[PDB]
Amino acid sequence: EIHTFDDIPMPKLADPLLIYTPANEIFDIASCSAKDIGFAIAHAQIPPGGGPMPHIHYFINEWFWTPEGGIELFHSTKQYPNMDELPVVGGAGRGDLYSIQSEPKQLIYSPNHYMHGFVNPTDKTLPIVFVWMRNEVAPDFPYHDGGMREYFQAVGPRINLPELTNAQRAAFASEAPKYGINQSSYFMEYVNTISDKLPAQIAKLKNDKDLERMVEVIEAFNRGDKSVTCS
Amino acid sequence: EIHTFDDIPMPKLADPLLIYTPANEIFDIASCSAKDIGFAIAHAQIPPGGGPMPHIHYFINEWFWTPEGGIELFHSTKQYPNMDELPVVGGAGRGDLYSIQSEPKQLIYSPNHYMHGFVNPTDKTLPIVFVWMRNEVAPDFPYHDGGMREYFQAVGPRITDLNNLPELTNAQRAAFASEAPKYGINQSSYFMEYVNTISDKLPAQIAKLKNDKDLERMVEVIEAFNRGDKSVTCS
Ligand SMILES: [Zn+2]
Ligand SMILES: [Zn+2]
Ligand SMILES: [Zn+2]
């Protein structure tokens, strides 16, 4: 009933890019591209209470992979195809979210336009892997990846951990639309309710085909295949 | 039911205490007491997205008064009598909260031990009044108010210039949670820490809670202080 995945490997860069995101996530992140495909991927460590506020993507489709479970995710059934329409009380209207208590090696797929987010509600640091695949409408970015690696590089300090400033926290939200994200700045901004009863509409979301294409790209880079680029 | 109240005046101090709380609230706060009663009161301005993460009181009973509505409050049906038992995963467990879309001049009573919080989810600053009354088990504090004013004064920077509000630091935000048990509060450090679900259907158990008698008493105290009745003290 619950979907799992054995492994999502990390593309191994000569000099790994390490970022501490303003949502308190320890990121090891890369961008890869090849014929007709572009994506960013992060292997992350999430401290007690770390995680992004609810947000919606316009340039990417996203996979979450929780090697140890424990991470609580949030997801809508409502889709928001219009980036110019924010889901706030002062207009388009806040949404309803459903929580997911992740299990070891669970794979959660979240297409563009869905509202999602996650938190570590435990007292220990937990691993998570994110894969952000460029969709068909994404503009080009320097790494051709849909824009997510450029986003985290732009608003998050390079990695004993550096310390987050108010400007960095406020920019995590204000800079987000340049990278095809509507990012709330506080938890209840885009949110009316949170429910622990998971709708079938959410539970059945799945796209193994593209993830496996991206895995082959990563493994190809790791084997030294010059026809792909990770960077 | 919607309980409402006409006015909760502010004790007018010679030297008003103005604090910018680590929860992005602009406070005008005072402590008062008389022979029979003790409390703190804040008239506050809550910017967009302002308001404290869910928390539980042990030294006070709380009233919220929303002169213009707009503020969204959260409240449990479950009480948490044991300060040493945290409502977290792996602990005594996160709780179910229910939201209240406040009406103009709505009065919300929240006894000690319930979980509550609020946020301004609008794009404009909104007013709110808090009254925090010293309950029967509260320790002695320098202001004999049950601890809330001492809490805010300890964790929040003084506002010296309304045009240049203080820049809150990481340490101050962390202290806002860490210092809280000293003042009889279990204060979460992020929204989902104490929270299992948020539901918009408000149970009639929560809706029923009220205590006009005690609010009326404190109102008199404030009004007598503002009249220079030396039988009471606000400071
Ligand atoms: Zn996302
Ligand atoms: Zn290029
Ligand atoms: Zn309170």
Stated resolution in angstroms: 2.1
Q: Distance (Å, rounded) from C-alpha A104 to C-alpha A111?
A: 22
Q: Distance (Å, rounded) from C-alpha B220 to C-alpha B145?
A: 16
Q: What is the largest CA-CA distance in chain A?
A: 52
Give the number of other CB atoms < 10 A from CB of residue A222.
14
Q: Distance (Å, rounded) from C-alpha B84 to C-alpha B92?
A: 10
Q: Distance (Å, rounded) from C-alpha B231 to C-alpha B63?
A: 24
Q: Distance (Å, rounded) from C-alpha A210 to C-alpha A194?
A: 30
Q: Check if B104 contacts A (Cβ < 8 Å).
A: no
Ligand 1 geometric centre to CA of A88 (Å): 18
Give the H or E element holding residue B198: strand B195-199
Size of interface A-B (CB pairs under 8 A): 57
Q: Check if A137 contacts B (Cβ < 8 Å).
A: no
Contacts of A121 (CB under 8 A, 6+ apart): A49, A72, B88, B89, B94, B192, B193
User: B35: distance to nearest CA of chain A, Å?
Assistant: 42
Interface test with A, best of B198, B199, B201 (most A CBs within 10 A): B198
Experimental method: X-ray
Half-sphere exposure of A11 (CA within 13 A, CB side): 27
First to last CA, chain A: 36
Are residues B170 and A164, on separate chains, in Cβ contact within 8 Å? Answer: yes
Looking at residue A91, its amino acid is G
Domains in chain B (CATH in brackets) are: 1-235 (2.60.120.10)
Q: Distance (Å, rounded) from C-alpha A176 to C-alpha A152?
A: 10
Contacts of A69 (CB under 8 A, 6+ apart): A101, A102, A103, A104, A105, A106
